[PDB]
Design a protein around this nucleic acid. Structure first.
Length: 632
RNA sequence: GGUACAACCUACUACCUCAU
DNA sequence: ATGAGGTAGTAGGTTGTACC
């Protein structure tokens, strides 16, 4: 039976507000004292001081305060105000952790001062057990999600710590400040460029960046520790967090009803067979191909041409090499290297600084679909100059000089070339074969006071029908923009298939803060079945059990799928907000999982999000970088 | 940059209650 | 306007495993 890090909150769902009256003291100062001492917040009214707490035995500090309490009490049910219940509950959780000697970090992370151990690679670095807490509302009930992670801080305070870092974390405050100096027993920090001497150097600790971890040699031990000792973090939850027993019973673990966890198996359809492995594209070729592979070379200078020419000719020019072998395995008609009439040399030169080639007759009158094999000396800071400056009507395939060998790198390179050709479909998903009718679009909003919107539309095979990016400023106007973009993608689908799609899938990153009834209205009154889906990759639900390639049903409306990846499993939550299509909810969820597999960047790696959403996000993040990795 | 992703620090924006 | 105190969501940018 699969374990899940969820614990039912067995307390009344109402929260009660209590009032205190102190005649001797000023009310605001009274609320300040009480607030500081109980690790809770007290709000002061005109004449009274009040606190909002959940319906549980909440012990006030100091006990003598009982005299100031009044019989007047207000009860606010969870039904009346859900937000107040949830936020008040978060406050009580934070108070419990603080009272039980836990450090507070941003994002509801709590560090342990007791449960620390010294790293083997570096004794001065201390590993702190840490827990991430979230409140989840499923099946009309409230559950608590607990995630074990580790926070790495210096073993001893800054002045007594051999290791030094850029910033410090304050145990009591819970905030981090830039470390200026630790001279002569006084530690100074920067808060706008304001420097002060802090009273307690022992309260401040050192936090570390990845570069610091590499510099001191414990960077790899961090990853080993995360993948390796996380299981103990799950096991010791009842013993270590037993103080949380007021709201929940930790000894009882959450039990998935039978049938609520289902494993999804994906089979890739190839030309002369089918498989469950992506790399088997090499065994069974491309679903469609029989296309010529035409490419030219670009070199930073003649010196690098000669320097890499040794491995270059053996890898690329002799027919018995792995490049031709792989290209034939993928079903290419032939491999041809274009030579220009000006020089019987198929290699061309570009300047690295501006990434521009001299305009030659050959490049201007080149055929449409050719690969520019561009060799890069090192990883450069910005690759936007390469995208903008390089010739427009040519598909760009950069490769690093250092990489030029591990076979799967070359094989992945040829696969990328295959993906960028419009006529070649590498594969189609066996289960997605009958989904030609459906149109899958993803919506992403990226902020920063102006907000930019991007959407993407794909079909069952994985072809990108349309991509739309807007960098306009921040209701009805953004829904007008969304309706025009949706209409444009609709028109692109009908252009591709000469039919209006009977089913449209709308997948949005995050929650629908935008108006719903308008969206469902204008999508629906074209008699096209629609489904509105909320996808959030920030979920706290996990387990020590392996959940990769599994779909878990929290409630009938909410599911969570874990994509297959080499690293620690992290779930993605999919929620069917509304559905009028012929598909059932289970089938729709399965389709969302399939959209992650409709396309592959390489045969060996997997996408975490559905392809429409992944494209929409990648386009929203960068203006010109996304052109390199997405064919459109 | 043949690539997916995890981790980490930093930072911002919005909002909330105070309040000069 | 602007400064506390707090919560929430995400972007920049470096390093790590993994694909054989």
């Amino acid at each position: 039976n699969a374990y899940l890090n969820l614990y039912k909150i067995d307390i009344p769902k109402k929260i009660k507000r209590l009032y205190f009256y102190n005649p001797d003291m000023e009310p605001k100062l009274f609320a300040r004292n009480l607030s500081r001492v109980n690790n809770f917040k007290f709000q002061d009214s005109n004449d009274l001081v009040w606190i909002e707490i959940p319906d549980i035995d909440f012990q006030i500090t100091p006990k003598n305060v009982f005299q100031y309490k009044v019989e007047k009490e207000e009860i606010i049910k969870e039904e009346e105000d859900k937000k107040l219940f949830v936020k008040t509950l978060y406050k009580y959780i934070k108070k419990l952790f603080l009272d039980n000697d836990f450090y507070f970090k941003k994002g509801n992370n709590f560090i342990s001062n007791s449960e620390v151990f010294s790293l083997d690679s570096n004794e001065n670095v201390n590993a702190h057990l840490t827990y991430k807490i979230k409140i989840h509302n499923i099946s009309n009930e409230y559950y608590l999600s607990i995630l074990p992670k580790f926070t790495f801080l210096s073993k001893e305070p800054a002045l007594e710590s051999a290791i030094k870092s850029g910033y410090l974390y304050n145990i009591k405050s819970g905030k981090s400040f830039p470390y200026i100096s630790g001279l002569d027993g006084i530690l100074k920090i920067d808060i706008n460029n304001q420097i002060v001497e802090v009273a307690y150097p022992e309260n401040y600790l050192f936090n570390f960046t990845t570069r610091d971890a590499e510099k001191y040699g414990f960077s790899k031990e961090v990853h080993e520790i995360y993948k390796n000792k996380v299981f103990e973090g799950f096991k010791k939850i009842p013993k270590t967090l037993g103080f949380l027993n007021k709201i929940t019973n930790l000894n009882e673990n959450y039990q998935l009803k039978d049938g609520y966890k289902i494993f999804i198996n994906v089979i890739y359809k190839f030309k002369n067979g089918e498989s469950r492995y992506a790399k088997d594209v090499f065994k069974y070729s491309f679903y469609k191909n029989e296309q010529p592979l035409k490419a030219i070379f670009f070199f930073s200078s003649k010196k690098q041409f000669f320097e890499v020419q040794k491995s270059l000719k053996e890898l690329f020019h002799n027919k018995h090499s792995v490049f031709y072998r792989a290209a034939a395995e993928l079903g290419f008609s032939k491999v041809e290297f274009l030579r220009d009439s000006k020089t019987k040399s198929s290699a061309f030169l570009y300047n690295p600084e501006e990434f521009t080639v001299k305009n030659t007759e050959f490049i201007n009158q080149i055929e449409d679909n050719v690969m520019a094999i561009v060799l890069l000396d090192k990883y450069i800071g910005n690759i936007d100059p390469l995208v903008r400056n390089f010739p427009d009507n040519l598909i760009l395939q950069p490769i690093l000089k250092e990489k030029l060998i591990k076979p799967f790198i070359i094989k992945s390179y040829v696969y990328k070339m295959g993906n960028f050709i419009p006529e070649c479909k590498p594969f189609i998903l066996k289960k997605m074969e009958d989904k030609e009718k459906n149109l899958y679009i993803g919506i992403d909003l990226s902020h920063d006071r102006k907000t930019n919107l991007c959407i993407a539309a794909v079909d069952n095979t994985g072809d990108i029908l349309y991509i739309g990016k807007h960098k306009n400023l921040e209701e009805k106007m953004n829904l007008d923009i969304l309706e025009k973009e949706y209409i444009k993608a609709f028109e692109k689908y009908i252009e591709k298939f000469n039919v209006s799609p009977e089913n449209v899938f709308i997948l949005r990153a995050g929650r629908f803060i935008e108006d719903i009834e308008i969206i469902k209205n204008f999508i629906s009154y074209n008699d096209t079945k629609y489904t509105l889906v909320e996808v959030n990759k920030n979920t706290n639900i996990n387990s020590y059990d392996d959940l990769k390639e599994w779909i878990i049903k929290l409630d009938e409306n909410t599911y969570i799928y874990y994509p297959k990846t080499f690293l620690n499993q992290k779930g993605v939550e999919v929620k069917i907000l509304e559905n009028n299509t012929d598909y059932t909810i289970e089938e729709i969820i399965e389709q969302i999982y399939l959209l992650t597999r409709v396309a592959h960047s390489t045969p060996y790696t997997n996408y975490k999000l559905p392809y429409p959403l992944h494209i929409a996000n990648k386009v929203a993040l960068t203006d010109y970088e996304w052109k390199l990795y997405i064919p459109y």
